[model samples]
Target chain A: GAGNKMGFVVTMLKLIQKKLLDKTCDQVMEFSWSALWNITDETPDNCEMFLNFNGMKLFLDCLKEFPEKQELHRNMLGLLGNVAEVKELRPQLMTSQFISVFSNLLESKADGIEVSYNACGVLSHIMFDGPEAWGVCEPQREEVEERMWAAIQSWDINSRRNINYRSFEPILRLLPQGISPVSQHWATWALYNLVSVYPDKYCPLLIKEGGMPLLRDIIKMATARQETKEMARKVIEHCSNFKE
Target chain B: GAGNKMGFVVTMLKLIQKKLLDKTCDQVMEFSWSALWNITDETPDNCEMFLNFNGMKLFLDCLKEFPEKQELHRNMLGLLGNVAEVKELRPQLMTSQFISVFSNLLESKADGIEVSYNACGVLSHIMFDGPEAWGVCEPQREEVEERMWAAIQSWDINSRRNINYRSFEPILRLLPQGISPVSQHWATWALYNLVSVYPDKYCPLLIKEGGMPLLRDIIKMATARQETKEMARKVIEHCSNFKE
Candidate 1:
């Protein structure tokens, strides 16, 4: 009981110091980690103040510790997922390093299941927040995909990891944005997700850019059922404007 | 041999005389069955003579017989498929009854494999010629769908028929403009064919529409294998504007 109570006090001190003293932004970053893990539900009422160039800087600096602690890293992913969605943060998040940071978190092996689930969730948030952000970081883009594949098939001590691979839906959505390689675990799954959701918004662009070959490859490579292949074919037709 | 030659001569005479000359406009409103299918590759020179407005009328009048005599219907379909793609024939082919004819051909008791396969080819030609033609036949959509679906699953037919069925791809590019139930066979198969051939053009649209769902369905429904699906997914991703 005392430990829990003391944890709360420590969390509060971190929030206050981060919010007030502005001491290197470390405290705010730590607060983000704790808050994401359900360590504290009391959120700062103001999110706008955290969008300045300084906030981004502090976030980056604090991000260094993410690879070291499994639980804290998972919590940070949860927080970052939400933060990435904020429109104001979109521009700043588009930076190469910011994407790299997120990618690293995804690839890190601090704790397999816990990190994998949180990584999926965080990646989803990132893709949803700004799929266009993927254009900035090529290396991180490739690395994240490799690690994602590992997470999906990982039979490590964390069997909990691959069970809920469905949570990777948002990552799939952004994948067609061009970051993830099709060989990666979530790649084809991601493509399926985006086109099935809001066809009108994306189908036209696909047609404009040559969508037929892409579908053909999936038909060739994936172990999906015939029903899935048919649906994919249907989507290709809708985009191609073929007569049915 | 003698009987076959005699049959052709008598049918030609009946078309030119009974259908074209003997009756008045109201008595002989449409072309007789013999006149529609009588002229063939051997009579191309003769058919070419009627290539103007009169010839177009003759050809259209012939289209009415596409539901009977499976081989004859296929011959007609091949002729139309060839003609519809010609730039000069574009305007003539977009007649009010044109889309309906294809719809009817797909709808009739014409349950053979070759006929169905040719039907897909014919549909592709017409769609490629004038996509907007579908809007006019909005009334008989359901009936068309019923007919086409009946034929799409005709594997119980001869081995040759089965081969034909798999060989021809449906034209699904026309689905978004209007709902034509008859178009499903074409939609399903055309998408599969086209996606395999041109993934870059269609994947982005899949992403825009609903992303994962569309991708999943297309990949699922396709006749191709996993490698195909994977490659097609890549084309789709490239088209999706995904950047890394």
Candidate 2:
């Protein structure tokens, strides 16, 4: 038992290491996608090993190196979401650099639906503690909140001007426009968590930004999966039942 | 950062513990379901902790405690599927009792489609390593294969007797009779893996057991999802082109 090594995990790390140095970007992308898919069954030990291996740094590096690569971003964000599942790793992931990168990705107009979905997943898991539990140690909580506010503001401004909200206008933009069930589920759950945790403050903001109608549309849509519809209905209820 | 506790994780664990002891079984079931839903984002630490807490034993205990509860069994199997994703835990789950329990559940005609789906998920993951990689430790591999063979036998025997196949007649009963895309996907993929690993033996067995017309029917059905149709055709091709 002691001598048994995780052959698959080791092979994946080495493959990414080799591809990062000598291979073309396309080849690296292929390995990166494969790594993400296999690493679904990652453990705590694997997360520590990845962190020590400069895995997060490599991922952020790829984020910039392949700015136009939607598949790369989607895979990277998915890997990051999985990695961020470890509680001890959250602080390292909650830094300014990580938040700034994610915020920009969430704010960018060019990101695809899959990329946006994964981005929301990473953000929801990391910032899911909401305000009360957030600022106990780090000030970057405000930075994340500001990004959320900025997203809401942009959506509000767009709604008033009769202009279409860009696809990547953070979490709010995803509710009405996101196509895939995965995207719809993540976007709906993120908003539910947001409204539930900050019912007094965010509920009115959500209603003012026209979130009620969007959530209703999701519930009524025949194409939406039960998960999306369930979460949408809950978010609408959370917004509607706010005492404030 | 070192002393910061995972508030949400701690709270969820406590909620379940309290419900299990102090409240009704239905309340326990509710929290149990929610816990399983979240723990899909589980790590090795969570899995190890679950096993150490007698989680597997607790789940099987619930099977007897709530013999008529299909939802409980379904959720339990789904949780087992996620935990079995870890390679180290498979041996613990590959015991005679475990295999027998799963085999009986799979063959029970009263179980819901979701239950059978999850049961197959657990069995497929546990038995997936098959004969080649199986003998390093446990001999339960053959035990699992025997169950699979018996399932095929049951289906074949029934096909010739002008009797209808039951819902839980294992994999063959699922292809044509299974309604949900999820069931169709699991049963088709399970057979594909089966034939791929034992193409010479199992391919012909499947063909003789009347899996051919079922696969063809899936391809011709207009109501089937693309995924189901695609997997059905692939399994048919694999069986049809068996060279050995």
Candidate 3:
């Protein structure tokens, strides 16, 4: 694809704004946003161009102005998600207002499975930072896990989730020696889900990250239900079969 | 208020997660998200709770899962906005995947004004960092401004936008040395919008931020249209009447 369309870029913004109130307004809106999308797909300098023009302010205002349009919501959310993806660009999205929005969507209902699912996805992306960075969103952080769980349960299993987990660390963290069936169940499901869903992708990763024993331990010593145990066994089974 | 809902918080995450897949899934989802939203409204510790529980991943997943749902998008975007608002919690959001999402939404159509507006809003929040952080987003920054303009054009212009501008910095940034009526029009309109729409809020803000000189300069030093010039004059008039 063409690299930075710097000049070709501003023109997109020019015609749209110059014409002001015209049928082209919305047309140009998507086209320009689309143009930026291509440029910033995996590029960083373009992100600066976005910020250079106060793109953040203009972009967000529109998202809030009308929240229901599906396609618009996807693209806006998608762009923001991408913006959040940038390590450098991320901090800008970590504001109180954004937190509130994420927090509000945590409960995401009706179309919530998708809504709640992606709400959590974005938050998870932000969660990439540790406790130090987390200090900023302190309070809302208070109930995020609970809300995250609630949001998760409503969601059907087996969707293509793209969380960049470095290890089964979090899952392992939850899979400790002794815990409630709930915790055990949750942890077991997670291991099973990832290991089960994308065996090739997760199989080797989970094993490399150390999972066989966790699954074994869950099977041996845990206050979990057979349901949890069975799922844990399946994940283990995959490890044996895939051998990744 | 009371600080650090650590114990109180885990319970929230626990209760919801423990009782997975139930009539309570959605109910608990909102309650939990609401709880986190409040906790992180302006609190940092709570944001940690949210992060501690893999909240970001869950949140974003829900957002993407369902983009059309207005309330969910608002809350999710809101919570995320708040999260992004936090200086520390922001970086985690700036990932490639998130960038793609944000980039995709930049053009946000239909509910676009709101969608595009807020898409840019969240991106702007992420832009709080300087060129250093800007580097990570790189190319995306390139077309942000252009898309931002397109996004802005579609907006109704009277809605309450909550961008945390430090000063007339961005506005002043736009006003100076305009070579076109379009640019002049944009800057003039900005001054008028803020000064005219909420004189109490922006009049003093604009004046205190040294907008009078800019207005005066635009009136005398620029090659702008009468409309642009007249709007610039009005902003000056506001300063005279408000005397702030």
Candidate 4:
């Protein structure tokens, strides 16, 4: 008797799509976001249906329409991040135009903590597939780098693998800057995301970026937060043990 | 209580590895297969554990040791397929020497239905991520091509989307040959996997490779099964409507 629990999700999406075109009702919009969240409880079947029913297309269109709506942005980002946890669904999500959408949200610095963190969560998952899945063209490097820095600064620890730690160069540079310790805390965790992966690959890059001395300073600072110093220490150890 | 399920998986893997090194006993081998299968029930936790414990490395080594065992091969393929369902894990599976393992199994004509289907299922999942995930170099094309054709010929109506339909070129060439209706069923389903993704891109390539006439002939055959004829007609419609 196992069947489509996403029957409700698909129905709600169709309604949301219709409402987006016909009229903008805040009640209907709020309902749609909550419906998506309910389905995104990490069920593989729901995620499978999300892609099959072109939910990404609908979500992007809704995001475009409600660009000023931060709550909607947070909900959508959470849904995308949850669905991305399913491996087979990830390629389809990566190939979609969601990367640019998340990048824009991260660049919009006025966005609140909820929206920024959700954006970072989605970007983390997109980057989890590595740079190719990131789908960033090389010519847009400056803009991409700025937006990536913003995303990393907002990221909270949700464990994922295969992160393109090479892309954390901006975060590496920020570590040496006289940025606030709060900013440094976020930057340290961002680098931790990469160092947690292939230390052999990323550690040398981290060292070459002059991350060794910065990490060592953070560890030596008596006033440094425990978590921040702990992360800093781990990275320094990786840097010290790193060989060419 | 919900602490790392991977701890259990890793312990079990260590036990299985010791048994493999000790001797190839029927009970031990059967128990290992089922144990791996249980862990691969599509939990992200299980997949993450499988990778952390170097499960793919162990599974590959086990496969090499039992080259002639069909049940073992089937179980291993299914295990790999389930793990591949986890997106972060796909890169690990794709990069590992699993491609050759799968290709060899597909080419082993003496393998039974369970083995053959599971092998095709794994290949389909690998190819599900497209050319990048397939990662087979040009030098291995002829062998990879031959085995891919065999796998396609063994495939059934399990539907998925976003396959690199262009990968079916070699299989298309064999369609007009003096193959059986049963063989035609498998080939039709394999092509359907592609046509279901992008009719515009795949349909023309299918037509150019002489698939249109072959598919039409299958539909017209008096003894053709209903499902086979249905698939042929659908592919033919996509071919005839090609704008490019």
Residue pairs in collision within model 2: none
Q: Summarize candidate 3's per-residue lDDT along B1-244 as a digit string, tens digits.
A: 0112454456555544543434233544544544444334444555666777777666666555555544444444544544655667767767777755665665665242444544555565555454366545444665655655565455555655432232455446456564333444555665576666677777777777877887788778646556667778877877798883
Q: List model 4 lDDT by residue over A1-244, tens digit each.
A: 0112445566668878888887584755755665465445445566677778888888878877877776566566666755755657777755435666766666554334545545555554445444455555632434644565556545544444312322354454445444244446656876776666567667777777778888888887765667788889987776676653
TM-score of chain B, candidates 1 onward in order = 0.42, 0.52, 0.58, 0.59
lDDT for each residue of candidate 3 in A44-72, tens digit (9 for 90 to 100): 55566676666666555655654554444
Q: Alpha carbon lDDT of residue A101, candidate 2?
A: 75
**Candidate 2: TM of chain A?**
0.54
Deviation of model 1 at A212, angstroms: 26
Point out where model 2 deviates above 4 Å.
A1-5, A41-45, A109-111, A130-140, A149-231, A234-244, B1-244
Q: How many angstroms is residue B16 displaced in model 3 relative to the true structure, after the best TM-score fit?
A: 8.2
Cα lDDT over the full model 2: 0.55
TM-score of chain B of 1: 0.42
Model 1: runs farther than 4 Å from truth?
A1-32, A36-55, A65-67, A85-88, A124-132, A135-140, A155-158, A161-244, B1-244
TM-score on alpha carbons, each prediction? 0.28, 0.35, 0.36, 0.35
Q: On residues A1-244, what C-alpha lDDT tens digit does candidate 1 reach at each position?
A: 0011222334333553464345343434443444333321111111233443244454555555333655545555554544543445556566677666656555567655555445554454445443456677555555665565565444242133211121233333433333233232334433344455545555555555445565665556445445435545666765555323
Q: What tens digits encode model 2's per-residue C-alpha lDDT throughout B1-244?
A: 0010122234435545554565445745644543443344334445555666666666776676667766556556656655665667777776767777776666643333445444555666565544444433343655555554444323321121101111122455555643344445566765665566556656777777788898898888776668667767888888878843
Interface RMSD of each: 37.3, 18.6, 18.4, 12.6
lDDT of 4 at B200: 65
Of the pair 3 and 4, which is ahead by DockQ? 4
**Which candidate, 1 or 2, would have the higher TM-score against the true structure?**
2
